[PDB]
Amino acid sequence: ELPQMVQQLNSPDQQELQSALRKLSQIASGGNEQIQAVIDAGALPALVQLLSSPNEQILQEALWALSNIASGGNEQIQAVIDAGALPALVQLLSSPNEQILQEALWALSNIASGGNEQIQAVIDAGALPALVQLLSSPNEQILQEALWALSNIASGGNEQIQAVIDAGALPALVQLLSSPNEQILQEALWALSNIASGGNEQIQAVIDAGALPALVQLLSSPNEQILQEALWALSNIASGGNEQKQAVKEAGALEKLEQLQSHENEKIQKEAQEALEKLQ
Amino acid sequence: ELPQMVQQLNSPDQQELQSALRKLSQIASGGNEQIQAVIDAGALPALVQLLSSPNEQILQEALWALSNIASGGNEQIQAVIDAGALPALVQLLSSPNEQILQEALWALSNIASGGNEQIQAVIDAGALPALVQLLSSPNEQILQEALWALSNIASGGNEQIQAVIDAGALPALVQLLSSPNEQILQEALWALSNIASGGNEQIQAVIDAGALPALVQLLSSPNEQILQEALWALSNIASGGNEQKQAVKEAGALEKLEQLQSHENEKIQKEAQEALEKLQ
């Protein structure tokens, strides 16, 4: 039934096309063997071409299909890349449709969840300026997806982190530390912690962007998930050299971390101890 | 609005029930305040009853709604446990339907992402034998979810980590260190590093299970994400007593650790330096 579904992706009937896309994403959602069967049946050139469709209903199903395929192994992500999905995904970051924007962002984050080569392919496709620009969106769901995409890219090597910094992610992320939306706040904190997980120059860039006052302030958050993300970001910063460690101490982190060693939450006490250990 | 949908979760009409479930999942995915409003409206007893449903679609949706409620604060996760979700969830770990099994594992990993009280509730409900059995699964998608759930349980205190060891998780985790699948290998390394974040007795159990030669070998990985995971597992083992530190040296880690201080990736350099400093 798989070669018939593939043939149905070349159908001009919009209902037949939408049905074939739904059925292929269903097979692609069931593991690496099933994804590979979809790849081997030749679904990818057709899926990639469908990303040029102006119809929202087709685009949503085609993007959902590609993100499920991109949820497999690094070789399966590479197959999506080799079929040329990335230039088409980067173009969809200009889409005025907020639902399409979310799907394209999710597809990109799945590709960026692969190895360092897969992340580099996302950078080389020019995704970073469009991702950073999306951090100005008033749409909370778009913000969350753009932030998750950036945190995946920033989970790569030192050059992948530097690319995120050079595209201007830091001033946008620091501004998002003022967000009243705790879900956006957690995503901004996670993205900063991934950037702060790099070398001394990367950590220094987080400091220079003015992240420390807001990070230390969030260590007092009544929301324990926010507290833990802020603490993780600061612990990564504390991994830096003496200049980075001194900046953390000047921002008032010592008094907060010492106080956190007695906190009710065992995970918080534990991470505060490791952070305080790095600083001294 | 909310009381109506809570009443609709008890409706005899399958469509009115499916729509109420989807609506409840959407509100529950919008942060802690919206989760609290769903709890206050009394959605949990009805959601818990739906875990006994013969309908595959209703089951997957109820598991997804519960995983969203369980993505909140520790007190909100405790509300899911107090409503009696755990015996029904643990039972669903024996499901032959991989779609249901994935959702049940995801719900459990969210509950196990809480404090020691919430993790202990998962252990006391008998989740560990079913999880350990799933480590032998030929389905890579299920194996990853099971490894993630196990790593969350192992993120707790020494009592919770010992329960993971007592369930015979270590021989299954050491066997997975030979996996050609990089995603499975990453998850197995993460589960091991959490177990190794415990006290000397928990670290010695990891050593005795024969993890060190595989961990030492993975320091030669060209995949930086695998390398980092292995470095963190070794660094946690090296945080033990002199007997645990001696085992790492005996396993031949010192040479490669010193060489990795000059690795291209500056974060690898720091992690190798930190590991080597703990040993010396």
């Binding site: 945190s151 993300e229 993780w232 991470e271 | 995983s67 790593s151 590093s193 963190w232």
Partner: peptide, 10 residues
């Protein structure tokens, strides 16, 4: 149409 994200803090 279900989206799940997982994150690890050492």
């Amino acid at each position: 149409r279900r989206r799940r994200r997982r994150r690890r803090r050492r």
